[PDB]
Amino acid sequence: SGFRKMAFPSGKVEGCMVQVTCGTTTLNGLWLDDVVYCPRHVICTSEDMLNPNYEDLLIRKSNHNFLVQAGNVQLRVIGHSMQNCVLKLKVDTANPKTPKYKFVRIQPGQTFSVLACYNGSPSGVYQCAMRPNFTIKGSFLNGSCGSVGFNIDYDCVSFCYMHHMELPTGVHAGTDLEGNFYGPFVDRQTAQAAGTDTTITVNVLAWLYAAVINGDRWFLNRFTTTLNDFNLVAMKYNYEPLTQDHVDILGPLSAQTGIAVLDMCASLKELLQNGMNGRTILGSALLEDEFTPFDVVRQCSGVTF
Amino acid sequence: SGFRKMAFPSGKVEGCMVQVTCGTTTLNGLWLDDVVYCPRHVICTSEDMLNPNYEDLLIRKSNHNFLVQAGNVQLRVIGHSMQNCVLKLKVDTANPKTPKYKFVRIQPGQTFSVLACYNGSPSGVYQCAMRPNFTIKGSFLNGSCGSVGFNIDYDCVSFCYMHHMELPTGVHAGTDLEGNFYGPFVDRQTAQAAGTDTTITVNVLAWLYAAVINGDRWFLNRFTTTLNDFNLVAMKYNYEPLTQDHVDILGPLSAQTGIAVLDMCASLKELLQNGMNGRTILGSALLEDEFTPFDVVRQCS
Ligand SMILES: */C(=C1/CCOC1=O)[C@H](C[C@@H]1CCCO1)NC(=O)[C@H](CC(C)C)NC(=O)[C@H](Cc1ccc(F)cc1)NC(=O)OCc1ccccc1
Ligand SMILES: CC(C)C[C@H](NC(=O)[C@H](Cc1ccc(F)cc1)NC(=O)OCc1ccccc1)C(=O)N[C@H](/C=C1\CCOC1=O)C[C@@H]1CCCO1
């Protein structure tokens, strides 16, 4: 038993991380088959980051302007192109450690593991959630751009995130591996702010089920609430509305524990109105929302990858 | 910026995990060079779990009684021995993925990463701390024995934990890689319980420094405390005593932030007295104690 914020094993991704240098800018790249992916702002100088014209900057750079280092071996770049906010560097050698992989775009509320890297070397791994405002609450220092987020399904690595920037509140913004930003952000050093962050209601409910599974049940009650009545309360506390799809997804956990979703919603509604009253749930004094229903089933059933 | 409960990348350890089967028991083993390490209770029968005589049980086994599987390949066992509560299986092949590694015994309050495994396959990685009562608050299901905890420094893996058992409160007990249990626990299914769990005070203080480094100052105050007065108060909240050694260890963070250690101790005294009053610190509504001073420096710099 027990319940922890667990990341996917990172070995398959560690074997793809490289170092990319253009001029004085050095960050991380993702080496898959014979291509290295990295943020396009690697071609910017500290002064070109204010109002960059990436079309112009890239036209002026050549293959030799890019230095790619895989460990202590330095990869010959034979071509380069741009796809949205990611730079694609062709190298003359396929990564022999390329795993089975896909590029996937995640949606808010879905979780993934972040492999934080510096100078092409992986330093740490942690589990994150894409927030409803399309930011992530990460831990990144300078030089961490190009770090990637991923999930593992069967034996396939699904890359879903590449790190690009930090917003003034200390939260982080990035793109998918096709270079499309998550959220209304741009890769420029102009004033930007994320919208109001809301709570991922379906994930909070999944975590309450995990708590029950592990024997935490002081918060349960005899009452049930309708989806419409619950949503009236949730919107007042900056909670995401719960849809019928969300209820369906919690079905498995609802059956395993014998607690109806709308009964858990009543428990959650009361927790929102009265707080937690000096009690904790699974070792937390806050309502945790970075576990999806699948995450709970996966951890409580010992799924391996 | 930001602050997260961060684990080490697990690849170097993934390449060492194998499946070990003896009789009807299947669990995880650690394959380093030409030796596979696993809990010795893999040799127990369903009736031998209360008072096993492991020396006697092992004498009765032959090399072919142990089935070791690295992926879909079977490793030939050519020898076996016991070191405390760990079984050592000699195989005819050195693991080509063996990293640089050390065996280390950690002290309470020290953190490490756990690679939870089942049937020799990794399922997840998470960061843990050795609690003052010599347990860990892990996430483990049946079949997880032999999962290991580790740190990585440079490219060297320091193995510090191997998982053996769960105690009635849902907490976990295991050994170092020399087979010596952390705490007074034994690999027998006789009644055992962990002592009262206390809070790792020095780690809470390091995390408050991390909060300041990250721009949070709302919990500070104008007071200072003596070390003795702090410990008299903290022990009333089931906090571990803070020693002068702990104060010395916080010196670097005290210098980086310009906040004296005993001044931060005064802030913690007030936080214990008032709670958080609906506020959070580094995204938590509780005082977190599973980050060491070393962890804070590494993650924040
Ligand atoms: C690892 C094993 C055992 C065989 O194959 C594996 O992979 C488990 C890990 C444990 C299960 C859940 C998470 O941690 N180890 C054991 O099952 C261990 C075997 C003993 C050391 C020979 N026994 C336990 O952990 C007991 C509790 C238990 C047993 C079975 C189970 F499925 C879950 C939990 N703990 C124990 O025996 O001592 C504590 C105790 C005993 C009696 C009264 C009060 C307390
Ligand atoms: C060209 C930009 C996109 C490079 C990028 N810029 C930013 O992240 C800045 C925030 C920042 C963070 C840490 C620093 F040390 C310096 C700057 N974002 C920003 O300016 O937002 C707009 C704004 C808002 C308010 C006032 C002014 C401007 C960048 O620095 N990426 C870093 C990585 C870099 C850039 C190139 O090589 C790297 O590794 C990752 C950072 C560090 C921590 C997490 O995000």
From Swiss-Prot, chain A:
Occurrences of domain Peptidase C30 (ranges): 1-305
Superkingdom: Viruses
Annotated catalysed reactions: TSAVLQ-|-SGFRK-NH2 and SGVTFQ-|-GKFKK the two peptides corresponding to the two self-cleavage sites of the SARS 3C-like proteinase are the two most reactive peptide substrates. The enzyme exhibits a strong preference for substrates containing Gln at P1 position and Leu at P2 position
Reported impact of residue 189 to A: Does not affect ability to cleave and inactivate human TRMT1
Crosslinked residue numbers (Glycyl lysine isopeptide (Lys-Gly) (interchain with G-Cter in ubiquitin)): 5, 90
Activity modulation: Inhibited by pyridone-containing alpha-ketoamides compounds 13a and 13b. In turn, alpha-ketoamide 13b (tert-butyl (1-((S)-1-(((S)-4-(benzylamino)-3,4-dioxo-1-((S)-2-oxopyrrolidin-3-yl)butan-2-yl)amino)-3-cyclopropyl-1-oxopropan-2-yl)-2-oxo-1,2-dihydropyridin-3-yl)carbamate) inhibits SARS-CoV-2 replication in human lung cells. Inhibited ex vivo by michael acceptor inhibitor N3. Inhibited ex vivo by compound 11a and 11b.
Catalytic-site annotation from UniProt: 41 (for 3cl-pro activity), 145 (for 3cl-pro activity)
Signal sequence range: none
Stretches in topological domain Cytoplasmic: 1-305
Cellular compartment(s): Host cytoplasm; Host Golgi apparatus; Host nucleus
Assembly, per entry: 3CL-PRO exists as monomer and homodimer. Only the homodimer shows catalytic activity. Interacts with host FBXO22; this interaction promotes the proteasomal degradation of nsp5.
Its job: Cleaves the C-terminus of replicase polyprotein at 11 sites. Recognizes substrates containing the core sequence [ILMVF]-Q-|-[SGACN]. Cleaves and inactivates human TRMT1, preventing tRNA guanine(26)-dimethylation of tRNAs. May cleave human NLRP1 in lung epithelial cells, thereby activating the NLRP1 inflammasome pathway. May cleave human GSDMD, triggering alternative GSDME-mediated epithelial cell death upon activation of the NLRP1 inflammasome, which may enhance the release interleukins 1B, 6, 16 and 18. Also able to bind an ADP-ribose-1''-phosphate (ADRP).
Protein's name in the database: 3C-like proteinase nsp5
Whole-protein residues included: 3264 to 3568 of 4405
From Swiss-Prot, chain B:
Known outcome of mutating residue 49 to A: Does not affect ability to cleave and inactivate human TRMT1
Record's catalysed reaction(s): TSAVLQ-|-SGFRK-NH2 and SGVTFQ-|-GKFKK the two peptides corresponding to the two self-cleavage sites of the SARS 3C-like proteinase are the two most reactive peptide substrates. The enzyme exhibits a strong preference for substrates containing Gln at P1 position and Leu at P2 position
Result, substituting residue 205 to V: In strain: Zeta/P.2
Cross-link Glycyl lysine isopeptide (Lys-Gly) (interchain with G-Cter in ubiquitin) mapped to chain: 5, 90
UniProt activity-regulation remark: Inhibited by pyridone-containing alpha-ketoamides compounds 13a and 13b. In turn, alpha-ketoamide 13b (tert-butyl (1-((S)-1-(((S)-4-(benzylamino)-3,4-dioxo-1-((S)-2-oxopyrrolidin-3-yl)butan-2-yl)amino)-3-cyclopropyl-1-oxopropan-2-yl)-2-oxo-1,2-dihydropyridin-3-yl)carbamate) inhibits SARS-CoV-2 replication in human lung cells. Inhibited ex vivo by michael acceptor inhibitor N3. Inhibited ex vivo by compound 11a and 11b.
Residues annotated as catalytic: 41, 145
Segments forming domain Peptidase C30: 1-301
UniProt-reported outcome of changing residue 132 to H: In strain: Omicron/BA.1, Omicron/BA.2, Omicron/BA.2.12.1, Omicron/BA.2.75, Omicron/BA.4, Omicron/BA.5, Omicron/BQ.1.1, Omicron/XBB.1.5, Omicron/EG.5.1
Compartments it resides in: Host cytoplasm; Host Golgi apparatus; Host nucleus
Record topological domains on the Cytoplasmic side: 1-301
Impact reported for residue 90 to R: In strain: Beta/B.1.351
Function, as annotated: Cleaves the C-terminus of replicase polyprotein at 11 sites. Recognizes substrates containing the core sequence [ILMVF]-Q-|-[SGACN]. Cleaves and inactivates human TRMT1, preventing tRNA guanine(26)-dimethylation of tRNAs. May cleave human NLRP1 in lung epithelial cells, thereby activating the NLRP1 inflammasome pathway. May cleave human GSDMD, triggering alternative GSDME-mediated epithelial cell death upon activation of the NLRP1 inflammasome, which may enhance the release interleukins 1B, 6, 16 and 18. Also able to bind an ADP-ribose-1''-phosphate (ADRP).
SUBUNIT field: 3CL-PRO exists as monomer and homodimer. Only the homodimer shows catalytic activity. Interacts with host FBXO22; this interaction promotes the proteasomal degradation of nsp5.
Protein name stated in the entry: 3C-like proteinase nsp5
Included stretch of the parent chain: 3264 to 3564 of 4405
